[PDB]
Tab-separated table of C-alpha atoms in Angstrom:
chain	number	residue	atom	x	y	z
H	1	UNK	CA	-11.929	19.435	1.604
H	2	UNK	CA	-11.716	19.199	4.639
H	3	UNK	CA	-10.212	15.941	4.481
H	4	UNK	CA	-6.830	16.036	5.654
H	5	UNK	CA	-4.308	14.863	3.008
H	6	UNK	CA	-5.772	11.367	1.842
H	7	UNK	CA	-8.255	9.200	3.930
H	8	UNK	CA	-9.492	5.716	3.517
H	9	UNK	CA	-13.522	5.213	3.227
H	10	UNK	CA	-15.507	1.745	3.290
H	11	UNK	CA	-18.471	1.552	1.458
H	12	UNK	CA	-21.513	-0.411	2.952
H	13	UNK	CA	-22.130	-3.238	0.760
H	14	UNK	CA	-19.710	-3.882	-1.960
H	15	UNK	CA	-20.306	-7.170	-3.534
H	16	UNK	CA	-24.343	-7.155	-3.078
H	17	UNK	CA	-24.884	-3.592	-4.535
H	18	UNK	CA	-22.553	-4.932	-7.083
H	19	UNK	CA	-24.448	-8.391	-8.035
H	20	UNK	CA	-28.016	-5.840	-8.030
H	21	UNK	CA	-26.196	-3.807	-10.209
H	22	UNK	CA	-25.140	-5.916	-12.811
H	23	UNK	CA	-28.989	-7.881	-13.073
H	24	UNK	CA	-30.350	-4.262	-13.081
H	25	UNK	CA	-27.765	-3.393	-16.225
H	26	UNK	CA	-28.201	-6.983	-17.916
H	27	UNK	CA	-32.568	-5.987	-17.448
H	28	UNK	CA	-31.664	-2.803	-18.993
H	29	UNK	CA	-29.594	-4.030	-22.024
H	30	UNK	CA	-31.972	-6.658	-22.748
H	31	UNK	CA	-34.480	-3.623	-22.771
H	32	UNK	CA	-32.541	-2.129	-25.068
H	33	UNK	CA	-32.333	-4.920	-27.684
H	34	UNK	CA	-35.771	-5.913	-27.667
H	35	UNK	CA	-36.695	-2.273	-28.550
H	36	UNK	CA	-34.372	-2.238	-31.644
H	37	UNK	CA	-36.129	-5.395	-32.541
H	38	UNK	CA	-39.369	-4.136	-31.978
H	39	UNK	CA	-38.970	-1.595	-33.909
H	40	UNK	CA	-37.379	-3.466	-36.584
H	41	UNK	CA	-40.431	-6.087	-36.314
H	42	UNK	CA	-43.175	-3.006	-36.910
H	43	UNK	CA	-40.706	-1.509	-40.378
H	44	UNK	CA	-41.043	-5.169	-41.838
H	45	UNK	CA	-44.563	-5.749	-40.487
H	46	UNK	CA	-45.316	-2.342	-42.399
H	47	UNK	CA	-43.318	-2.983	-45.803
H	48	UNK	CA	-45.166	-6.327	-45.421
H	49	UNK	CA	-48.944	-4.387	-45.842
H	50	UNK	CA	-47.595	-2.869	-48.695
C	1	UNK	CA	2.730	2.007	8.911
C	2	UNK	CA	0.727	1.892	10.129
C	3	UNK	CA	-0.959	5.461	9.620
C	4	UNK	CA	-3.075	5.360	6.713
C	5	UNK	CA	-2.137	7.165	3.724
C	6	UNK	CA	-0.329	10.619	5.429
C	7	UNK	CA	-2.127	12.014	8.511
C	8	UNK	CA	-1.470	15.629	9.864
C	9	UNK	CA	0.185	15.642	13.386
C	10	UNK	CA	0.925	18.879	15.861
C	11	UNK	CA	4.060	19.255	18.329
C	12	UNK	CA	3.289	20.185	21.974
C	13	UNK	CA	5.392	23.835	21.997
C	14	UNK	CA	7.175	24.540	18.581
C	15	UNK	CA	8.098	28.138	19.010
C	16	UNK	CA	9.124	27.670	22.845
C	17	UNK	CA	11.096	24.499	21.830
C	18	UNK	CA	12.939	26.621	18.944
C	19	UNK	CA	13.618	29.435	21.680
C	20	UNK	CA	15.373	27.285	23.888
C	21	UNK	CA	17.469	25.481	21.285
C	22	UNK	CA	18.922	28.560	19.641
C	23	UNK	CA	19.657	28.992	23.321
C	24	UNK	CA	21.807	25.863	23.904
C	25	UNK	CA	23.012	25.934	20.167
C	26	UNK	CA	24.277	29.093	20.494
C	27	UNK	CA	25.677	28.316	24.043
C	28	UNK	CA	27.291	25.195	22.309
C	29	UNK	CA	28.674	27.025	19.395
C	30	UNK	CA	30.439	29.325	22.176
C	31	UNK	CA	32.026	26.658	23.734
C	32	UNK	CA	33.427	25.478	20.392
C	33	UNK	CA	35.230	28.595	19.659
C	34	UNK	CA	36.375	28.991	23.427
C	35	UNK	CA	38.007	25.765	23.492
C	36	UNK	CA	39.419	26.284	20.163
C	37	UNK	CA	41.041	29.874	21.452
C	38	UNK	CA	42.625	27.867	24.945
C	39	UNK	CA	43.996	24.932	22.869
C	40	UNK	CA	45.539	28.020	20.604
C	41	UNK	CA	46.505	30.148	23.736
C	42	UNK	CA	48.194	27.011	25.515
C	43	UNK	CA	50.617	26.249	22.777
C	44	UNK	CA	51.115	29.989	22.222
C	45	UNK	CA	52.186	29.731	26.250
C	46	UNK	CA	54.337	26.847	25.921
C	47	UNK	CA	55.875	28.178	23.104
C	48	UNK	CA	56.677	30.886	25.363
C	49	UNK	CA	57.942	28.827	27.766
C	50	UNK	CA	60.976	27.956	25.605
């Protein structure tokens, strides 16, 4: 509302937003994996003092 | 086509534009049933004739 029935909208930039998203969420999953690792890395590196 | 989607449109005089044809329908329907009754009342008089 107050759209009558069903309208047709056109977003600005389709296939740039769309190639920024996808090396913003590859950035962010690679994020994400080297924190697991990380914190992987400091269990062993403390097991490994002991 | 080639209206996108559905789109709402508005006639000029709807309720003026109903008057008048239930004016001429009516006047129409009158006509009907008039010529009907001659067509009956001429063979009625040429039955009469003989």
């Amino acid at each position: 509302y107050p759209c009558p029935n069903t309208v047709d909208c056109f977003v600005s930039r389709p296939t740039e937003k769309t190639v920024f998203t996808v090396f913003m969420l590859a950035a962010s999953g690679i994020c994400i994996i080297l924190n697991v690792a990380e914190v992987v890395y400091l269990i062993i590196r403390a097991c490994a003092r002991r």
